[PDB]
Amino acid sequence: LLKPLPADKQIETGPFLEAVSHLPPFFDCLGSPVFTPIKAVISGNITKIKAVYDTNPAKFRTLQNILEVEKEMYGAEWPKVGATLALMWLKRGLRFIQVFLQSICDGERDENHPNLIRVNATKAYEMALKKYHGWIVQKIFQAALYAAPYKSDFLKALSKGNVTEEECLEKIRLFLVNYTATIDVIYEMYTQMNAELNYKV
Amino acid sequence: LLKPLPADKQIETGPFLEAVSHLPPFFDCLGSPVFTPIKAVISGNITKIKAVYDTNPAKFRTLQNILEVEKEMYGAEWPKVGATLALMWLKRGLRFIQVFLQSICDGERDENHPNLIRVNATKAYEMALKKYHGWIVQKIFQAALYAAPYKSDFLKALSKGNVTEEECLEKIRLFLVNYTATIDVIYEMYTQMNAELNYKV
Ligand SMILES: CCCCCCCC/C=C\CCCCCCCCCCCCCC(=O)N[C@@H](CO[C@@H]1O[C@H](CO)[C@H](O)[C@H](OS(=O)(=O)O)[C@H]1O)[C@H](O)/C=C/CCCCCCCCCCCCC
Numbered sequence: 253l254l255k256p257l258p259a260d261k262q263i264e265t266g267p268f269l270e271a272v273s274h275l276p277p278f279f280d281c282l283g284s285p286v287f288t289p290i291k292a293v294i295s296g297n298i299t300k301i302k303a304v305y306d307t308n309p310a311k312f313r314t315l316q317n318i319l320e321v322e323k324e325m326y327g328a329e330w331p332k333v334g335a336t337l338a339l340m341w342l343k344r345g346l347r348f349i350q351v352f353l354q355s356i357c358d359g360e361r362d363e364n365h366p367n368l369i370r371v372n373a374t375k376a377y378e379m380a381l382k383k384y385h386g387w388i389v390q391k392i393f394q395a396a397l398y399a400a401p402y403k404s405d406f407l408k409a410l411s412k413g414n415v416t417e418e419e420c421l422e423k424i425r426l427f428l429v430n431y432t433a434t435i436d437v438i439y440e441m442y443t444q445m446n447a448e449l450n451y452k453v
Numbered sequence: 454l455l456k457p458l459p460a461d462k463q464i465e466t467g468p469f470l471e472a473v474s475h476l477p478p479f480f481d482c483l484g485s486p487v488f489t490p491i492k493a494v495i496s497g498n499i500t501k502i503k504a505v506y507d508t509n510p511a512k513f514r515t516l517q518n519i520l521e522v523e524k525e526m527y528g529a530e531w532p533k534v535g536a537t538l539a540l541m542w543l544k545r546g547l548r549f550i551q552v553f554l555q556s557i558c559d560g561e562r563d564e565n566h567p568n569l570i571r572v573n574a575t576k577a578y579e580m581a582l583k584k585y586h587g588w589i590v591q592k593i594f595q596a597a598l599y600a601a602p603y604k605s606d607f608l609k610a611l612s613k614g615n616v617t618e619e620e621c622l623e624k625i626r627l628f629l630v631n632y633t634a635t636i637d638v639i640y641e642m643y644t645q646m647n648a649e650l651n652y653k654v
């Protein structure tokens with residue numbers, strides 16, 4: 253999965269990229285081609301970070317190094333540049349997933365619609381993405397929501413082949429431990445480096 | 454641009470991929486981040502074709518060869534596989550662009566809205582894509598439309614740096630000659646090979 257955090261909280265770029273490279277395929281298990289463009293955008297972020305990393309894996313050994321090195325490389329253009337920008341967006345997608353999954357695991361629901369996950373996706377959107385989206389992108393989110401899988405198929409997909417919903421949620425809870433810790437460190441690094449931007453798309 | 458067609462109408466894969474690789478950047482000149490996911494999906498098609506080509510450029514020398522070789526490789530799974538599938542979708546995006554640009558050049562408009570290009574995009578959608586889109590994707594198209602550039606900025610973008618609208622449209626008309634011929638050959642090849650599918654997303 254995601255390997256745990258070292259004591260010094262430095263996140264190794266290579267292993268992080270191998271971990272997150274498992275993410276784009278998981279989109280196809282939301283069970284709708286509607287999500288293909290979102291898959292492609294997240295893949296694009298990962299590809300951009302990988303392209304920078306590959307130029308000098310020692311110089312870009314950790315995610316912290318990416319921000320440090322690029323700040324120096326790009327001056328006034330930073331942080332709206334390079335792998336710093338790609339990771340700024342990637343982390344927002346990762347945080348959306350974190351909040352979404354955590355919300356489902358925490359029993360958050362619409363009483364009247366137990367085999368949907370609309371309410372969980374809406375909370376994740378508000379906490380991770382909405383701040384950076386203008387009116388048009390928000391309308392697109394609303395449209396995409398109609399394509400969201402049934403809770404059961406979604407859980408069946410995350411386990412595909414037969415486990416109970418309860419067993420699946422326990423597996424998701426276990427995954428969430430290192431996943432949340434890793435995302436938290438990435439957000440902290442953007443904050444501490446003043447690398448976070450607040451422009452809307 | 455696109456190089457002209459040889460007498461035997463065989464389209465060389467390598468040069469075709471270099472030509473179409475100029476396409477994803479042009480999306481950014483629609484002047485709205487709303488189109489970034491569409492850019493990424495088209496880039497994905499091109500990357501998939503390139504990945505197949507790179508395995509054996511002689512075996513995949515022409516687009517016709519891709520379909521011929523893959524039909525043999527994949528049997529009952531073909532044509533819903535490999536570079537054949539990627540090109541099936543790419544050609545639909547290319548045809549959308551063709552019809553869109555041709556519609557603008559042909560003076561097609563909404564009298565009441567001369568600095569918009571909504572009517573031209575809608576015609577392109579109906580002729581190239583709509584057949585393969587279910588209700589949700591169609592609603593997404595409708596949302597994306599709100600982000601379409603002004604006709605003037607769009608034309609300014611295609612020329613960026615100062616030329617009249619009239620000069621820009623003449624340049625687009627010239628481009629459309631080899632572009633349309635090439636797309637026509639690709640559609641003909643899918644038709645003649647019975648490689649075209651009609652499933653909806
Ligand atoms: C390690 C991961 C763990 C894997 C295991 C997890 C298992 C979970 C199972 C399934 C996964 C669940 C899927 C849930 C849905 C995924 C989350 C949606 C994430 C959307 C992220 C949108 C980001 C965004 O707004 N992008 C925007 C900005 O893009 C960036 O723009 C920059 C310039 O300003 C740069 O050009 C940048 O490019 S780069 O070269 O610098 O990198 C580029 O990426 C882009 O313009 C807009 C895209 C359309 C907005 C997206 C609409 C949100 C809809 C998402 C649907 C959620 C509903 C799902 C229902 C369950």
Ligand SMILES: CCCCCCCC/C=C\CCCCCCCCCCCCCC(=O)N[C@@H](CO[C@@H]1O[C@H](CO)[C@H](O)[C@H](OS(=O)(=O)O)[C@H]1O)[C@H](O)/C=C/CCCCCCCCCCCCC
Pocket residue numbers: 285286288289472473475476479480483491494497498499501535538539540542545546549550553570574582590593594597598601602611654
């Ligand atoms: C050589 C080119 C010439 C360059 C110069 C041209 C200059 C022109 C200037 C600017 C460009 C103009 C831009 C106009 C807009 C671009 C056209 C929009 C094209 C949309 C194409 C959508 C295709 C589509 O529906 N895709 C769908 C199917 O994807 C395929 O699914 C397959 C499985 O069934 C495979 O997974 C496949 O992957 S692969 O690995 O096998 O490749 C994958 O690609 C995908 O699920 C759905 C995506 C969302 C639908 C797209 C919504 C349409 C909105 C487009 C906006 C048009 C409005 C623009 C206003 C001007």
